[PDB]
Design a protein around this ligand. Sequence first.
Ligand SMILES: O=C(O)CCC(=O)C(=O)O
Ligand code: NI
Ligand SMILES: [Zn+2]
Length: 348
Amino acid sequence: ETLNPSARIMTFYPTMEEFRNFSRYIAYIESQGAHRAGLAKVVPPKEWKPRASYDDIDDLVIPAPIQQLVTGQSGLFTQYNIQKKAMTVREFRKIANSDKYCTPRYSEFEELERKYWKNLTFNPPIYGADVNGTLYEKHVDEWNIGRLRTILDLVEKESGITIEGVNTPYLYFGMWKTSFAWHTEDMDLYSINYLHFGEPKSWYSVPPEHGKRLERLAKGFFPGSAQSCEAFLRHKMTLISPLMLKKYGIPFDKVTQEAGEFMITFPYGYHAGFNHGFNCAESTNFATRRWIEYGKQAVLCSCRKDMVKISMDVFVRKFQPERYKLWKAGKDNTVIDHTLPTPEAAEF
Ligand SMILES: O=C(O)CCC(=O)C(=O)O
Ligand code: NI
Ligand SMILES: [Zn+2]
């Protein structure tokens, strides 16, 4: 409980030498207590760039843009997705920067944040989300979201299963007021998010050690949804204002991600946020040894069946051989300490 005791969102500025080993640097920031906030920012070296120029993706296709309809009141909302026809990045950007959809004028972030929560349910925006692809140049070896080199790859490499968006990269083309609802990652994995260009992306995060409190709140406020899946928040449709969190004593922090910056989310870190205007982000999941225990206890959506589900078997057999027999029987009653860093952090 001694590292990052206030559990506030931390920001890191790795040197080029520190930057080169991804898994090692994650181990480092966890040794600093970064994981306790559920979310961390990493600012890459000035020298580092994922791609020389972004003026050649104009014809990139967004096959399934989503119009985000939001209904609700008193800081509690549900988001409904309407799939729109395919469109190109040009067409998206022109719509995004049009007077109908562009960022309103404002002075400070808190003003814009207020505008977001006041106008969430009006003028439904369009989000170019979940686009399969990468904007990295193929020769970039540092923090390449396409090939992060973590133990998550045991899913693809050993068992030959590709899960789109999970061990493959996703692109997100945002515009003003496009939202991502409160969620942890599938199987309570880590996620990494790089903002390639454009207006900022703002984030809310709840410390993993208080994630159960957010779940109780959500269940209380959406009792119908709670009855259908135990894990209805995994639907990613649930929006809850910071005013409501504050009212019910749920600790959280806020951070704004700027172009050229990484965000890292940690296992069982609930997060949500919105885009300030036209931008493009790239995202995927990854794992560390610490994640394995979260994966084994992750509570999954029960109402759908096509939901992302990863067999933990290969991970327990490889990294926890001494409890594999116990776990297969279902007698593994390990309790997770959310304040503990990943073992790989010992050297720090
Ligand atoms: O930018 C977004 O739409 C949300 C990304 C996200 O939830 C993540 O990177 O874990
Ligand atoms: Ni996420
Ligand atoms: Zn469900």
